[PDB]
Amino acid sequence: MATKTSIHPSVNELYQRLAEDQLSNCFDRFDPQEKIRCNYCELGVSCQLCSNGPCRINEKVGATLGVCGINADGMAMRYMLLRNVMGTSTYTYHAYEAYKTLKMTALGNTPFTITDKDKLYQMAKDLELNTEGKPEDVAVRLSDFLIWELYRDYDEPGKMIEVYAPLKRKEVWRKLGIYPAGPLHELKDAAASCLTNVDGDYVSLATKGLRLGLSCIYGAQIGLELVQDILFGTGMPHEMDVDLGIFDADYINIVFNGHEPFVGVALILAAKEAVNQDKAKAAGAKSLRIYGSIESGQEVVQRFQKDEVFRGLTGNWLTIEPMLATGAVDVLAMDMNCSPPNLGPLAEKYGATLVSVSRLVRFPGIHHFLDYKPSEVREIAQKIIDIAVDSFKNKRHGKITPKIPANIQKAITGFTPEAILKALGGSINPLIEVIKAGKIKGAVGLINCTTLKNGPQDYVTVNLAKELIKRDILILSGGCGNHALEVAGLCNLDAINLAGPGLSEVCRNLNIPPVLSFGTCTDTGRISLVVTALANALNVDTADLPVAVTAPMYMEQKATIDALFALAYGLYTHVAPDPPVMGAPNLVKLLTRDLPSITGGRIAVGSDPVKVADDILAHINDRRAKLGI
Amino acid sequence: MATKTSIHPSVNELYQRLAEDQLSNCFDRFDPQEKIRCNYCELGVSCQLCSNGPCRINEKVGATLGVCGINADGMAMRYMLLRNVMGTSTYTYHAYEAYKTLKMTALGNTPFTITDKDKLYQMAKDLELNTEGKPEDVAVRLSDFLIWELYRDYDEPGKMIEVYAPLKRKEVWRKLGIYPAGPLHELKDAAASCLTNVDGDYVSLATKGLRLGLSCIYGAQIGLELVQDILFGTGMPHEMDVDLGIFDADYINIVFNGHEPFVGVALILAAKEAVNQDKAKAAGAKSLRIYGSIESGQEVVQRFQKDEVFRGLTGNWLTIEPMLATGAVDVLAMDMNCSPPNLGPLAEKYGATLVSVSRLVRFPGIHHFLDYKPSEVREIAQKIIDIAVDSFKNKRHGKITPKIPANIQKAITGFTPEAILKALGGSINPLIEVIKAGKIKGAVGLINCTTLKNGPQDYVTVNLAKELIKRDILILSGGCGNHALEVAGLCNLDAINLAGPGLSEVCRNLNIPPVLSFGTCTDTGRISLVVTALANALNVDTADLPVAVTAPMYMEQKATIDALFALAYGLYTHVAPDPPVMGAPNLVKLLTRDLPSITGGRIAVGSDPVKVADDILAHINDRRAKLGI
Ligand code: SF4
Ligand code: SF4
Ligand code: FES
C-alpha cells in the first residue's frame, strides 16, 4: 500500500491484520478524504456559522466578504477561536473534577489519600490560605480556592498568576490587556464573541485567543496538575516498559485510556486485592493486569512503578485501533479524548469490551456506561473488573487468536521540575552553567499530538527530536508526541549517544536522557514552571531565553491552546501541520511576523525535520548572542 | 433586477441608495456566495475540527466516515451542538451582566433603581429567600442567588426549574436524563464533548443539545428577564412608532443596537437632562432624540413610552445597513449581536459615528470603544451624547443629504403574561373557554431571526403570520421576527381585519391585536410561563396542547437554542431555512419522526407560508381531537 501508516514496526504489523480483516481504520480512511480535500477549508476561508451561508472567500468571482460582511482574516481567526473554546473546556472540565476529587478524598469518600502533604502545605502557604487544623482541612480549603480560580470573573484579581508567572511577563500582559479572568468566564466570552455579527476583527479575536491560553494555564492546568501530585505523588524518574509487546494474552487485561487518571488509579488499587486476582485465576487466566493508554496512561507512568499488576504504557492515539487488533484486550475503559468513534466493529472482531467512564465519551457500540463521580469510583472500578472477567471467559479466551508484536522499549518517565532540581544537586545553577558554556545550546518544550496529515504516525516528531538533540538542544516532552519519543527509544540512557557533543557530555555526567518525559499536554503549565525558573535565574524575560516550543504533528485544540499560551508567554512556537489560517494574509502576518513586537513570540511552520530544527537553533543562537553567550 | 431584497418598501428604497453609492451590503453580497455554494456544508456533511481534516462524506469514493471514524449523523449533530454553545454563551453573558447590574444598583452605584418592587419580593418568596431588611438587601440576595443558578454543577439541584417548569415536564426530563446543570457548566460540557474523539454519537449529541436548551431557559433567560422587569418595570400594552420614517434629520439622533438594554436606558435618562437638550440646541439641532434598534430596542419599547426623547424602534438586523443609508444617524451604539462587521465604510459615507459599548463587539472602522460596567454606565451615556453632538456638527448636519423613507407604522408593544391576565379579567379561564369552543383553534410562539437564505427579508415570516391568523391561530411573537410583524402592521388593531372569524371576534372583545408582541428571543422563557399556565388549567402536559413554535427565517443560534428548548418542552417546532442537517438521514429521522415518542416534540420544515401554516393547523387539530375539543 501507499497508505501512510507509522514509523513504529509494532503498529505497522497490526495495521496488516486490520487490513487483512478488512476493518475500517484511520490509516485507510485518510486516503478517500485525500481524493476530495476542500481547498477553502484547508486555508481557513470557508464559514458555516449562520443560515446566510455556507460562505467562501473567492475574490476572482466577487466573493470578497461573507454575506454578513466579514473578511477572510476575521473568518479564519474566528473559527480558530471557536475551536479553542473546545480545548479550553476540556482542561476546565478536568480541573473541576480534580478539585472535587481532592475535596471528596479529604472527606473520606474515595479510595484515594493525601500523598504529597509537603506540596499541599507549600501551595496553601504560597496562596495565603489558612493552614490550621488537620491536613484534610487544608485540602478542602485548597480545593475551594482552586474552584474559585476557575470561576473568577474578569473583575476580580487572580492569585495563581501572581505566584507562578515571572515579573516581566506580568507587566507585558497588563500593558496588552490580556490578564485573564477565570477560564470558565473567558471561554464563555470567547464563544459569545464568535457568534455571527459580534466580533469580526481578526486582531481582537487573536488577542482573545491569547487571553484564553493564559486562562487555561494559570486558571486550570497548574492547579490540576499540582492537585494530582497531592493525591498521587510528585513524579520522580524511573524505568518503564512501553510499546505493544507489553501485552500477554494469558492474563485478563484492562486498559484505561483518556486524559483523567482517577479511574485508572482506582482500577490498580482494586486489582491488587486478592479477591479480584482469585476471580481472574478461577476464570482460567494467569492473573489480572492493568495497562495505560495515551494521556491517562502517561499520567500514571509519571507517578507509579511497573509491577506485577500495572504493566506500562501502550502508545498514543493512533495506536488504539492497532491495540485492539492484538486480540489481547478484555476491557478498554475510556475517560476522554482520544476515544475514536469507530472502535465498535474492532472490539467485536477481536473480542474486547468497551466501557465509557465519562459522560463526555459516547459513540456507537459501547457496551457499558459508568459515568465518573469521586464517591462512586470504588464501585466503578470493581464493576469494570467484573465485566473484564466475564468478557475474558465468554468472548476472548479460547476464541480469539492473539497477535502481539514482540517490540518492547525502555523509557525513563516521571521528570518534573522537582526531579530536575534533584538531578542537578538541589539548584538550577549547574544547568545555567552548562548553557552559558555552550554545552547545551538551549531547550525545547515539545508539546504535541500525533496526526496523519503531515506524515506517517510520529514521523515528523521523532525525526525532529533526533535533529534537535544532535544540535545540543535538550528536550522536555509532553503529549502523544512524548509517547512517540518513549516508544522510539529517545527517553532512555542509550539515547545519550544520539545527542551532539555538548548535550551527550552533560547527559552522561548527570545520568539523564537527552529527552526528559514531563508527561502530558496538560503539563504545559508545569513546563512553564521550568522556563519561569530559568527566566528568574538569568534575570531576563521569557522572550529573551534560549528556548522554543514545538507541536510538530498537532491534531486538535488541546495542543493549539498550549501554542496560544506559548505565544502569549513570549516564545518561538513551531506548529505543524499548518493550522487552517493560511488564506488569511493579514492574520498570517500578525502571527508569524508582527507578534515579536507585541508579546515577543511568533508562529513558525514546516514539516521538514532538518529545516525545522535549523530554524529553532537559529532562534536559540540569536537569543544566546544577545545574552552574551 | 433579480436581487433578493426585502418585503418592506422602506428598506427597498434605501437599498437603491446603497447600490447607487456602490457600497457593499448584505443583499448584494448574497449573490456572489450563491455562485459557489458548497453542497457538503449545506447538508452538514463536512468537518473542520482537526488536522486530519478537512473531511467530507462522499460514499462514491469510499469516504463514508471521517478520518477519525465519525459518521455523517455524528458529524452534523456535533457541529450543531458546537454552534449552540455560542448561542448559550450569549444568553449566559447577558444574564450575568443583568445580575451584576441589579446588585450594583442595590448598592447605589448606577443611574437605575428598583422599579417593580412587587416582582422583587414575590420572586424572592417563590425562591424561599430571606425578605427581611431593606429592599436593597433583598435585591442583593436575589442577585447572588441567580448567579449561583448560573454556576451550579450537574450534581446540585436547581430551584428555578422547580418553580417555573411544570411537573409533567420535569418527570419526562428526569426519566430522559436531561435535567440540566447551570448553563456555565452545561456549555463547557457541550464544548468538551465536541472535541475530536470525545462524543461521536448523534443521539447523545442531540440529547446534550436538549439539555443545553433547558439550561438556557431556566438557568439564564427567566432570571434575566425578571431582573430587567425589576429594574425597568413589567411591560404593559401601549402604542409605539416603528419603521425608518421615525427619523428626522434636524435632530441629534442616537440609536442603541444589540440585546442588553442597560446603555440604552442610561442614554434616555441622560438625554432627558436639560443641560443635554441645551447642548443639542446650541449645536443647531431641534433637540436630542434616542432610538432603539433590534433586540435592545425591543426590550425598551416593551417597557417605556414614546415621548419627546425616546422615539421608538427602527427595525431588525437586516435594517441596520439601510438605516445608515438614511443619512440621519449621528451615533450607532452597539452592545451585542447583530452588529455587522462591514458597517465602517457605510458610516463613513453617510456621516455616522460608530461606538462599541461591549468588549464582545469589535470590527474594522469603529470610532470609539466604551466597554460596559454598571458603575461606569452614567459616564458612558454622557460620553456618547457629547460624541453625538460633535458628530452632528462636524460630519452630518447640512453636509450629508438625508433620504428618510416616509413609512411609519403603529404597533401595540409590551405584552407580558401579566398583561394577558389583565386583559382576560384576572384569570386564564376566558382564554381556555374560547379555545375549547373553537373560536381560537390554538396558539403559536413565533420566535425568530431574519435572514436572506429562504427569501427577501421577512417575506416568509410576515406571510406565515398572515396565514396563521386567517386560520384562527393566535400568535405570541419575539425576536427580529417580532420586529418584522410590527413593521408590517400585524401588531395593531387594524390587523384584526386580517384574522379569521373566531380570532377576530375574540380580538375585538378583548381589544387586542391578533399578534401579541412578547419582546425578544430572550423572552422564550417568559413565553413558556404562558404555555405552562395553559397546560395547568387543562390538567395536561405541554405536549398535549394545541400550540406550536416557529422560527421561519432563523439565522443563528440564539434562535436554534430556543428551538432546542421547544423540542425538550414537547412542542412541534417549525424551523426554516433548513439547519445544516439534511445529509444525515438518521439524525433527520430522530428530529422529525422519533422525538414525539421521546420528548413529545418534533422538528418541522419548509418555507412555503400556506403549506407551513396548514401543517401547523393539522398538528393543532390533532391535539384538539385527542383533548375532545
Ligand atoms: S457568519 Fe457571515 S461568513 Fe459565516 S456563514 Fe454567516 S454570513 Fe456567511
Ligand atoms: S474530527 Fe474527524 S471528521 Fe472532523 S476533521 Fe478531524 S478526522 Fe475529519
Ligand atoms: S467542505 Fe464546504 S467549504 Fe469546505
Numbering used by the authors:
A (entry chain B), B (entry chain A): 1 to 629
Task: Give verbatim lines from the article.
Here, we report on the structure and reactivity of such a deviant enzyme, termed CooS‐VCh. Its structure reveals the typical CODH scaffold, but contains an iron‐sulfur‐oxo hybrid‐cluster. The active site of CooS‐VCh undergoes a redox‐dependent restructuring between a reduced [4Fe‐3S]‐cluster and an oxidized [4Fe‐2S‐S*‐2O‐2(H2O)]‐cluster.
Two μ2‐bridging ligands between Fe2–Fe4 and Fe3–Fe4 were modeled as oxygen and not sulfur, based on the lack of anomalous scattering contribution, shorter Fe−O bond lengths and less electron density at this position. The mixed cluster can be divided into two subsites: a [2Fe‐2S‐H2O] site and a [2Fe‐S‐2O‐H2O] site, together generating two almost perpendicular planes fused along one side (106° plane angle between Fe1‐S1‐Fe2‐S2 and Fe2‐S2‐Fe3‐Fe4). The Fe1 and Fe2 atoms of the [2Fe‐2S] subsite are coordinated by Cys338 and Cys480, respectively, with Asn337 in short hydrogen‐bonding distance to the water at the [2Fe‐2S] subsite (2.4 Å). Fe4 is coordinated by three oxygens and one sulfur: the bridging oxo/hydroxo ligands, O1 (1.64 Å) and O2 (1.98 Å), a hydroxo/water ligand (2.07 Å) and S3* (2.42 Å) that is part of a persulfide formed with the thiolate Sγ of Cys521. Fe3 is coordinated by two oxygen and two sulfur ligands, O2 in the μ2‐oxo‐bridge (1.86 Å), Oϵ1 from Glu295 (2.23 Å), the thiolate of Cys449 (2.36 Å) and S2 (2.32 Å). All iron atoms in the oxidized cluster are tetrahedrally coordinated. In the oxidized state, two channels with widest diameter of approx. 4 Å converge near the hybrid‐cluster.
